[PDB]
C-alpha cells in the first residue's frame, strides 16, 4: 500500500552506521537540504558529483575545476547502474558506484540533508555529520552556481528588448542594425498567418470568411479536419468539409485560433537536437493546449477568458524554445547537456545562465513584431511568474497552472514545483476541481498522443 523505502538502501545505511528517516517528497522542502546526484562521463569513465539542488551545475566550471569534458550518461547506462540494485532513482550514496565522487562542499551547510530513497517520492532525511563520513575518499570543492545569483526577469519587460539584444550581441556574432528586428534573422511569417491575423480583428469576420481562408492551405485544412476528427473532440466518423468541421464540433472560436497556431508552428523547424528523453514538443503543446480547454471549462463564468484565445496560449506557450534554436545553435545544444545534468532545475534559470535571457522573453518579443493579439504577448511573457497581476493575466496564469501540474502528473521538464494558494484564488478553482479536470484529460491522453504524430512531418 504505502511506498517505502527500498530494503537493500536500508539495509546499506544500517551496516554504515547512518541514521535515517523517511520523508515524502514535496516542493514545500527547501532547495538547499536536497542532495542531488548526477553520473557524468567522458572517455575515462564515470564520475558522481553531487551538489545541493539550491545550485546548478556548470559544466564549463566543471572542466575548469577538474579538466575533464563530462556529459550526461547515456540513460541505458544509468538504467543498468540503478537497475544493478534495483532502484528507479539515484540516491546521493557513493557506496553504490564504483566511480570516483565529487561534491560541493556547500552541501554540508543545511544541518538536515534529504536525498533519494530511490523509490519516488520517498527522501531520506540524514544528519549532515553522518553523511560527511560517506565523502572521506570524494574530492571537495566549490562549483555549483547558487540560483540566487541567476537574476530571470519576470519583473521588468521593458529591459526585454535591451537584453535580447545583449544576449545576441555576444553570442550571435552578426551585425548590430539600429533595430533589434533587423539585426536578427527574422522569418518572414507565413502569408496564411499573415492573413488570419487581420482576419481576427474584424469584429464581423464569419464562418464562410475562415472557411475560404482555411481552404488556401489545403495543408493545413487537413490538419484542421484531422483535428476535428480526433477521438478526443469528435465520435467515429463525420468529415466532410472543413465547414462541417469548424460548425459541428470544433465551433468558429475555436477554428480561427487552432488555425492561426497550426500556421505559425511550420514558420520554424524542428530543433536537430534536443535533451535526452525529453517530452516532444508537439505534445507538450498539445497537452498544454488541452488542460487549458478543461480549465478554462470549470472557471467561473465571472472570469472566463475568451475560450479560443486561451488555447492558442497553450499551442505557442513553447515557441520561444523553437526560437532560441533557431538564433543561438550552438548554445542551444549546450543547454540541452545542462538540462539532462540539472533534473532539479526547469529550463528557465538554465537560459538566463547561459545566454542572459529567458525562452519566455525572447517568444513573446517575437510575438507582438509579428502583431500577434496583446493577449497571446501577455500570455507567454509571463507563463513563469504565478504572482503577475498585470493586463490580461489570466491568460498567462492558465498557462502556469496547467504546466505546473502536467509536471506533478510527469510531462514537462524539471522537478515537482509549488502551486501557490493565491494563484487558485484568482481563478476561482479549487484545487481538486483543477485536479480533476487534468485527471481528467489524462485518461485521454491517448487520442493526445496521435494528434501530436501527424506533426512529426
Given at each position: 500500500?504505502?511506498?517505502?523505502?527500498?530494503?537493500?538502501?536500508?539495509?546499506?545505511?544500517?551496516?554504515?552506521?547512518?541514521?535515517?528517516?523517511?520523508?515524502?517528497?514535496?516542493?514545500?522542502?527547501?532547495?538547499?537540504?536536497?542532495?542531488?546526484?548526477?553520473?557524468?562521463?567522458?572517455?575515462?569513465?564515470?564520475?558522481?558529483?553531487?551538489?545541493?539542488?539550491?545550485?546548478l551545475?556548470?559544466?564549463?566550471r566543471?572542466?575548469e575545476?577538474?579538466?575533464?569534458?563530462?556529459?550526461?550518461?547515456?540513460?541505458?547506462?544509468?538504467?543498468?547502474?540503478?537497475?544493478?540494485?534495483?532502484?528507479?532513482?539515484?540516491?546521493?550514496?557513493?557506496?553504490?558506484?564504483?566511480?570516483?565522487?565529487?561534491?560541493?562542499?556547500?552541501?554540508?551547510?543545511?544541518?538536515?540533508?534529504?536525498?533519494?530513497?530511490?523509490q519516488?517520492?520517498?527522501?531520506?532525511?540524514?544528519?549532515?555529520?553522518?553523511?560527511?563520513?560517506?565523502?572521506?575518499?570524494?574530492?571537495?570543492?566549490?562549483?555549483?552556481?547558487?540560483?540566487?545569483?541567476i537574476?530571470?526577469?519576470?519583473?521588468?519587460?521593458?529591459?526585454?528588448?535591451?537584453?535580447?539584444?545583449?544576449?545576441v550581441?555576444?553570442?550571435?556574432?552578426r551585425?548590430?542594425?539600429?533595430?533589434?528586428?533587423?539585426?536578427?534573422?527574422?522569418?518572414?511569417?507565413?502569408?496564411?498567418?499573415?492573413?488570419?491575423?487581420?482576419?481576427?480583428?474584424?469584429?464581423?469576420?464569419?464562418?464562410?470568411?475562415?472557411?475560404?481562408?482555411?481552404?488556401?492551405?489545403?495543408?493545413?485544412?487537413?490538419?484542421?479536419?484531422?483535428?476535428?476528427?480526433?477521438?478526443y473532440?469528435?465520435?467515429?466518423?463525420?468529415?466532410?468539409?472543413?465547414?462541417?468541421?469548424?460548425?459541428?464540433?470544433?465551433?468558429?472560436?475555436?477554428?480561427?485560433?487552432?488555425?492561426?497556431?497550426?500556421?505559425?508552428?511550420?514558420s520554424?523547424?524542428?530543433?536537430?537536437?534536443?535533451?535526452?528523453?525529453?517530452?516532444?514538443?508537439?505534445?507538450?503543446?498539445?497537452?498544454?493546449?488541452?488542460?487549458?480547454?478543461?480549465?478554462?471549462?470549470?472557471?467561473?463564468?465571472?472570469?472566463?477568458?475568451?475560450?479560443?484565445?486561451?488555447?492558442?496560449?497553450?499551442?505557442?506557450?513553447?515557441?520561444?524554445?523553437l526560437?532560441?534554436?533557431?538564433?543561438?545553435?550552438?548554445?542551444?545544444?549546450?543547454?540541452?547537456?545542462?538540462?539532462?545534468?540539472?533534473?532539479?532545475?526547469?529550463?528557465?534559470?538554465?537560459?538566463?545562465?547561459?545566454?542572459?535571457?529567458?525562452?519566455?522573453?525572447?517568444?513573446?518579443?517575437?510575438?507582438?513584431?509579428?502583431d500577434?493579439?496583446d493577449?497571446?504577448?501577455?500570455?507567454?511573457?509571463?507563463?513563469?511568474?504565478?504572482?503577475?497581476?498585470?493586463?490580461?493575466?489570466?491568460?498567462?496564469?492558465?498557462?502556469?497552472?496547467?504546466?505546473?501540474?502536467?509536471?506533478?502528473?510527469?510531462?514537462?521538464?524539471?522537478?515537482?514545483?509549488a502551486?501557490?494558494?493565491?494563484?487558485?484564488?484568482?481563478?476561482?478553482?479549487?484545487?481538486?476541481?483543477?485536479?480533476?479536470?487534468?485527471?481528467?484529460?489524462?485518461?485521454?491522453?491517448?487520442?493526445?498522443?496521435?494528434?501530436?504524430?501527424?506533426?512529426?512531418?
Amino acid at each position: 500500500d504505502a511506498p517505502h523505502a527500498p530494503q537493500v538502501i536500508l539495509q546499506l545505511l544500517a551496516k554504515l552506521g547512518i541514521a535515517c528517516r523517511e520523508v515524502s517528497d514535496s516542493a514545500e522542502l527547501p532547495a538547499a537540504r536536497r542532495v542531488q546526484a548526477v553520473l557524468l562521463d567522458d572517455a575515462v569513465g564515470t564520475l558522481l558529483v553531487l551538489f545541493p539542488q539550491s545550485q546548478l551545475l556548470d559544466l564549463a566550471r566543471l572542466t575548469e575545476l577538474t579538466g575533464r569534458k563530462l556529459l550526461a550518461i547515456k540513460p541505458e547506462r544509468l538504467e543498468r547502474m540503478l537497475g544493478k540494485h534495483e532502484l528507479h532513482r539515484l540516491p546521493a550514496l557513493p557506496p553504490l558506484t564504483s566511480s570516483p565522487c565529487l561534491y560541493d562542499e556547500r552541501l554540508l551547510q543545511e544541518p538536515r540533508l534529504l536525498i533519494e530513497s530511490g523509490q519516488p517520492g520517498i527522501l531520506l532525511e540524514i544528519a549532515s555529520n553522518d553523511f560527511r563520513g560517506l565523502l572521506g575518499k570524494a574530492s571537495a570543492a566549490r562549483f555549483g552556481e547558487p540560483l540566487e545569483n541567476i537574476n530571470l526577469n519576470l519583473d521588468r519587460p521593458d529591459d526585454d528588448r535591451a537584453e535580447i539584444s545583449q544576449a545576441v550581441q555576444a553570442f550571435t556574432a552578426r551585425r548590430i542594425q539600429q533595430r533589434l528586428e533587423q539585426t536578427i534573422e527574422i522569418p518572414p511569417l507565413p502569408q496564411t498567418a499573415q492573413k488570419i491575423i487581420k482576419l481576427r480583428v474584424d469584429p464581423n469576420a464569419s464562418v464562410d470568411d475562415i472557411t475560404g481562408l482555411v481552404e488556401t492551405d489545403p495543408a493545413l485544412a487537413a490538419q484542421v479536419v484531422s483535428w476535428a476528427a480526433s477521438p478526443y473532440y469528435a465520435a467515429p466518423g463525420k468529415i466532410r468539409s472543413v465547414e462541417d468541421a469548424i460548425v459541428r464540433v470544433l465551433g468558429f472560436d475555436l477554428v480561427i485560433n487552432l488555425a492561426l497556431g497550426l500556421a505559425l508552428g511550420k514558420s520554424l523547424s524542428l530543433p536537430k537536437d534536443q535533451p535526452q528523453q525529453a517530452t516532444p514538443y508537439w505534445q507538450q503543446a498539445i497537452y498544454t493546449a488541452a488542460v487549458i480547454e478543461g480549465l478554462t471549462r470549470a472557471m467561473p463564468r465571472e472570469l472566463r477568458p475568451e475560450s479560443g484565445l486561451s488555447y492558442l496560449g497553450g499551442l505557442l506557450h513553447n515557441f520561444g524554445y523553437l526560437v532560441l534554436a533557431h538564433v543561438f545553435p550552438p548554445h542551444f545544444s549546450l543547454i540541452c547537456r545542462h538540462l539532462e545534468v540539472n533534473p532539479h532545475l526547469g529550463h528557465a534559470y538554465i537560459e538566463q545562465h547561459l545566454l542572459g535571457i529567458t525562452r519566455e522573453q525572447i517568444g513573446a518579443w517575437l510575438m507582438r513584431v509579428w502583431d500577434m493579439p496583446d493577449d497571446l504577448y501577455c500570455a507567454l511573457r509571463f507563463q513563469q511568474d504565478p504572482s503577475y497581476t498585470g493586463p490580461n493575466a489570466v491568460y498567462a496564469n492558465l498557462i502556469c497552472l496547467t504546466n505546473r501540474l502536467l509536471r506533478n502528473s510527469g510531462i514537462g521538464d524539471g522537478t515537482q514545483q509549488a502551486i501557490p494558494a493565491a494563484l487558485y484564488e484568482r481563478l476561482g478553482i479549487t484545487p481538486e476541481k483543477a485536479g480533476d479536470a487534468v485527471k481528467k484529460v489524462l485518461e485521454a491522453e491517448a487520442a493526445l498522443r496521435e494528434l501530436a504524430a501527424q506533426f512529426n512531418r
